[PDB]
Symmetry: C3
Subunit: 408 residues, 3 copies
């Protein structure tokens, strides 16, 4: 009974209210132990679907599309991704000069120290996209190396169709069918898991507002508004405009990508949201060729929401330490924050941990006593910011896929 | 050559003789390094078949029968499994009052103090039944999450069969067929492995008896006879009885379930016995809809043998510690042992580890010096006790499966 | 554009020359960070293919051929492998008495010490050949357990083809197809990756010669000649001969095993070369039933080149230490090095680590101050000796598969 998109808006509005109120009376722990378990289940059920929906769909996508098209799709979507993420930092820097976050605040030094993780070599990150055991890749996480093998196998399936033989032609047929069976099966599960969505959506914002909704006051409120307006200016001033330029109706696009966004926002897992956003692409008739490859890649590569968050936050820590950033340093963030955004995981809370890499680049390391105590205020409300981020991170990928789709 | 059921009975009788003799002359070391490995190969060979046989069969299972039907079957088998587990504890309690194991014996306090392995939250265990990577589930054991994803998968295939499409209807059929292929194959294998069964049976008891046969004398003899006749009354006073009331011939049931029951007794791994118990279920012509779900679920959930074991051993420790248990402390045993038995793994010797959980609830902890030296005497003959447990643990799943089967 | 078998030879010759030049002028680090990655990309690409190609092919192979044939092929190949490995050591010893590596040399003692790894019991290594989760076998490396289960599955698919049922016989057919689909699909992928091979080959020797080429002077040069002249005399005197005897024209055998021999040489992974060496088998038209099972087993069991290397080194150390080995100690190397060779991993540089095992049997342990400092000279030019080893390790697998196929 009842429409599904309504249930989520009701679970979202009611849950955000129920969270705040329950949380302001000090029931931060009563929500976590009682409410959260239902929001947890919603994420768990989705994660389930990620690996099969991604692997199977993309073998069929790479079998259906031309190997010259797939490669063209690739270069087009990377150029899109890179420029959207670059414009996203500058939008968060402009939002950090418009609003002033932590302008004249002096924070309690010596409270908490942090320890930055040494990032692995670029060579190793790049060579690691080619999996040495595809069964291993599936067996544990690893969407990117899966993407790679999938395409290669999909492509090989096509070459086995052109075969003179009959025994080969059929066995290649039999494989691709069954793989597509799983694919089609998965897209059916996501609907069923979307049926639980409202209950899960309710519980998740109830937890986030109950645990952190009470700390969105003071200079942490002004850093919050700087972000959410900045992200709102990313959806309108960038996506709505680039969809208008490419002749796609931007209003009915939000109609088609509603379920992805609300999941991304609440779930705060770009990775987790993948089977919803992938269905949302099939909803709007984009070829399994294109969206099977662009979405999972964009799940990790394209993070406009994160790119922006790391901008406004770099400025926050720079304002609450006294000294401002050079006009040459403002262009040194744009590069590193896009590099940090690419590198960030499609998992909850990973942006703030990756914000540490864009903090050394400007000159204020996270081992510095007072920088560390400033960072800890932001990490205090990170799950509030995380919600906006992920949603834009996800919206960005779908916007891209739609554009590449109309071009071909 | 030769009948196979006879071979296992010869391997069992000869093995337990050769083991008791060799072990009495102190050749526990020789039988461990020389004979036991042949009994291991049999165990290994069985484990092998579990993942593919469970998964592949249950996908077919959930597609084969109505999603409503599977639901009812579930509620029916859970109501079966709980009541049979609760009857099992009370039967062991009467067996621990009929006999007095550890009646007037004092033990050498301080030999070995045991240690708390903190249990995980039930909310987490329950949440853990949903697998976040179906591959990762299969990849490493994990029967329950696989049961989840399997049913879910199967159920989705059914929906693709009712599709208006042709390309969707065929590729879903193709998939169900391939997965059915695997299922069928793993049944064929378990027949093969069942030919090595006698050799592996021989070696397995030969080791259990060599290692622990001698110690089954004195008060430990009384506690052994307590358990065994208690288990015998579970089969004759509960299984034989409930099979009659439901209109299934108890003796033709025991004939068809023989291989399963023997594997279980010798293997002492309710979980390793799964592919034999699953074959046995198919041998009695039961539907893959029913037994594909019930047997793997019951392999972990329904442990009447473990429940009865924990019963008698609670009374054993209580008698060896002097003070008896109240009528309300005995009704407190019933509930905790049900939890402990369900919570107990289908792996060998695991119930003695969960016995500690049912000893905290009465008021006699495992870290208390003289309880710890009383529990060590039990752990000393646990392999002799484990054989019986596992056998009844597994018999009950088949009994329950058969009963729900006839009713449908 | 351009043939492949030409491109590889130009990459190897130009690459071995560019390597030696760059490294002699101290750029051994420059090659390692710049050139080497390309050569690693090749290895990742091949490795990708090993798990699906080995599994899918052998299930088809074992379903393709008679379980009596496969059994016979197995005993024929094991005999072949053990005999050729034994002969390889006796050839190495004859090279190391003809040449005198480390005759009049006395080394700087005490610089470096080594740590002998504790090898697990043979019974444990044998038992672990049966997997306990086939999905865990694939998931992480584990060619041998896969091999085992693959034959089993293949043989079961067959018995399912003889069933009176329609629904069983078609599902058995469907599964076999989809598995075969993948197998055919992987072989095409190797055709593609072999296109990158010359770029990979060029880089991989650039590295090896840059790092260790310059070290091949003095007494270390005399050992390198000893191993190579031996390995050559294994190719001509053992393969070219045993092939002619069995009636396969050797000259065209080398022609059709070119891609494998050169991948093995440059890549140094007997293991990672397998998808090339399995294709090369198919190219000369050997039955899948035979090479699906001989070649992957051979990758781990049959290492003529390693066995030879261990012979000529066991004679280098002993020469540097001063006191010679007995006639009965030479025959003690023959036995230990065949053993060690069988045990030695299909992975780059493993024979050297395994050389310790054969050294202890002659009475010169690796903990000994001066043995450990001579052994570090051998370990210095290892990649150099490893290239030749690996090639001859693989060639004997193809020679064995070829011979055994001709006898049927
Ligand atoms: N939850 C965010 C993580 C981040 O913003 O760093 C995402 O997956 O996009
Ligand atoms: N062998 C028993 C283990 C136990 O009951 O503790 C089983 O798996 O059923
Ligand atoms: N690279 C060699 C290692 C060895 O010589 O043991 C091989 O894979 O065969
Ligand atoms: Na994203
Ligand atoms: Na990212
Ligand atoms: Na059980
Ligand atoms: Na249990
Ligand atoms: Na080899
Ligand atoms: Na080896």
């Amino acid at each position: 009974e009842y429409p599904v998109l309504q249930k989520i808006l009701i679970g979202l509005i009611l849950g955000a209210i129920v969270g705040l109120i329950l949380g302001h009376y000090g029931y931060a722990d009563a929500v976590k132990t009682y409410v959260k378990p239902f929001g947890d289940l919603f994420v768990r059920l989705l994660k389930m679907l990620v690996m099969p929906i991604v692997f199977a769909s993309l073998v069929v996508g790479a079998a259906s599309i031309s190997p010259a098209r797939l490669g063209r799709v690739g270069v087009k979507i990377v150029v899109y991704y890179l420029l959207t993420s670059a414009f996203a930092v500058t939008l968060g820097i402009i939002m950090a000069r418009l609003f002033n976050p932590g302008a004249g605040i002096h924070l309690a030094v010596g409270g908490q120290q942090f320890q930055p993780k040494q990032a692995p070599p670029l060579v190793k990150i790049l060579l690691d996209i080619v999996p040495t055991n595809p069964f291993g890749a599936l067996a544990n996480g690893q969407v990117l190396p899966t993407i790679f093998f999938a395409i290669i196998l999909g492509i090989a399936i096509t070459y086995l169709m052109n075969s003179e033989n009959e025994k080969v032609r059929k066995s290649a047929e039999t494989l691709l069918d069954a793989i597509n069976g799983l694919a089609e099966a998965m897209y059916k599960i996501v609907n069923g898991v979307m049926q639980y969505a409202p209950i899960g959506v309710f519980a998740l914002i109830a937890y986030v507002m109950a645990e952190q909704g009470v700390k969105v006051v003071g200079e942490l409120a002004k850093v919050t508004a700087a972000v959410y307006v900045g992200l709102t200016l990313q959806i309108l001033l960038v996506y709505f405009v680039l969809l208008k330029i490419y002749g796609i109706d931007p209003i009915s696009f939000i109609k088609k990508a509603k379920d992805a966004m609300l999941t991304a926002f609440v779930t705060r897992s770009s990775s987790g949201t993948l089977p919803v956003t992938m269905r949302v692409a099939k909803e709007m008739g984009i070829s399994e060729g294109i969206y099977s490859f662009t979405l999972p890649l964009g799940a990790t590569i394209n993070m406009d929401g994160t790119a922006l968050y790391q901008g406004v936050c770099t400025f926050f820590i720079a304002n609450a330490l006294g000294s401002h950033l050079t006009v040459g340093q403002q262009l040194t963030i744009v590069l590193t924050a896009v590099l940090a955004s690419i590198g960030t995981a499609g998992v909850p809370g990973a942006g703030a941990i990756m914000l540490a890499m864009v903090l050394e680049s400007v000159g204020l390391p996270l081992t510095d006593p007072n920088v560390a105590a400033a960072y800890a205020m932001i990490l205090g409300i990170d799950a509030i910011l995380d919600m906006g981020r992920t949603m834009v991170n996800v919206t960005g990928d779908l916007t891209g896929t739609a554009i590449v789709a109309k071009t071909e």
